[PDB]
Design a protein around this ligand. Structure first.
Ligand code: SAM
Ligand code: SAM
Lengths: 232, 234
């Protein structure tokens, strides 16, 4: 919930709409005239907004109740909350299709090479101590024709909006400290967005990982962005 | 609609509003004691979603074993009360319960609520939206029994100058991000202005005393970003 709250606050809840757009744009899932089940992997899943979102979208639009989902997070306490959310909604709790896994996105040692059709990472890759290694691991995990999809904060192009965002980013750790004694969380959040490579640099890092037909779509003037790539 | 209100609460308090509400319920400490046989009559106003209402009944059950006290959840917005009924259904508690009623009504008048029928009156972050605050306080006095308790959780005036300074920068930038990210300057500016025009701790206390309440008082929370105000009928 700590990350849920910071995402709610930083984006004023609009991250929900970014996630809805992200899922609809990817448009992943087993088509009705096919019996091959897709193997999803959602890295840095946390409470599971994307993982459950992908599964829900695949069912309602395609009638897919076959595809498997691996939800991966480095933090066991963050993962548990995802499974805790799964029981209360009562849909993906104790489901053979859905696996919760404690693992580092830079390694993913438990995952087999060339085993996954769809890789997603949503607002998590910026927290990786090594972003490139995580991108290389993403490539390793996917099989030919596999789609990499990333939702993450980015660079705001417009100077006025960026200037307003910087002040927002300045006042957040101050307010987080005074009200919630949470300076470190908000400062690390703000600094992780600042350090993160812009739309073009990140695209190059995705290409450097080995992905082809790589591109991006800046959302809400580039406060965040959707990056993609296809294997081979 | 209720999601929108939960979001603005999270954003303005940075998620701390849940700690305010838990302190609010714990401080009130309401419920039929195990040495008593008389159930209490609760009224909750301007909280159709049920955050405080469900919390009050849960607390009374947990601490005292009180599973008999009645609760009237009152909101002017029918959409908010639908969500509360949806919450109660999905919760598996307080849905289709004779103890719990969901009622459409204006908090300034509470016409469907009889005089001297309630033991506890609670309003949480809703009274600042009342077009006339005094009318709401007078009505709260009317529905309460002798010995009835008025309890209020609402945004207030910050008493810590450094917290105030930080808040003023917050209040300026927040609606700007509202306009830029959410395409919604109005809601956030309206929220900031509704907090600004609300009476301070001493003024609101006076208004509660003008309603007729005795032994009135307040406790500032988080440097006075919000406050708990109370009053006892006779
Ligand atoms: C804001 S959340 C993202 C949750 C969810 N994907 C969303 O968009 O709301 C960040 C999550 O990434 C996880 N994380 C951070 N570093 C990681 C790493 N190296 N490998 C896997 N997960 C990581 C954190 O534990 C945290 O739960
Ligand atoms: C932000 S919410 C309250 C937040 C949360 N549900 C709680 O009680 O802590 C404000 C609520 O007060 C209600 N409200 C506003 N003006 C009112 C009035 N004059 N009478 C009754 N309810 C009112 C609104 O419909 C809205 O649902």
């Amino acid at each position: 919930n700590r990350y849920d709250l910071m995402n709610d606050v930083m984006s004023l809840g609009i991250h929900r709409l970014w996630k809805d757009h992200f899922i609809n744009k990817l448009d992943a899932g087993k088509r009705p005239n096919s019996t091959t089940p897709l193997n999803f992997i959602d890295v840095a899943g946390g409470s599971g907004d994307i993982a459950f979102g992908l599964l829900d979208h695949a069912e309602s639009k395609f009638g897919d109740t076959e595809s498997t989902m691996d939800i991966v997070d480095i933090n066991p306490d963050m993962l548990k909350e995802g499974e805790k959310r799964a029981m209360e909604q009562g849909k993906y709790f104790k489901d053979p299709r859905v696996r919760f896994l404690v693992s580092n996105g830079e390694k993913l040692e438990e995952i087999d090479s060339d085993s996954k059709d769809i890789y997603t990472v949503s607002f998590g890759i910026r927290n990786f101590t090594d972003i490139q290694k995580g991108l290389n691991t993403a490539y390793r995990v996917l099989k030919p024709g596999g789609i990499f999809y990333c939702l993450e904060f980015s660079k705001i192009e417009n100077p006025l909006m960026d200037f307003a965002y910087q002040q927002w980013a300045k006042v957040l750790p101050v307010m987080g400290s005074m009200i919630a004694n949470d300076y470190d969380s908000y400062q690390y959040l703000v600094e992780s967005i600042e350090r993160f490579p812009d739309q073009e640099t990140f695209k190059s890092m995705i290409e450097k990982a080995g992905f082809k037909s790589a591109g991006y779509e800046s959302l809400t003037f580039g406060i965040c962005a959707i990056h993609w790539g296809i294997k081979v």
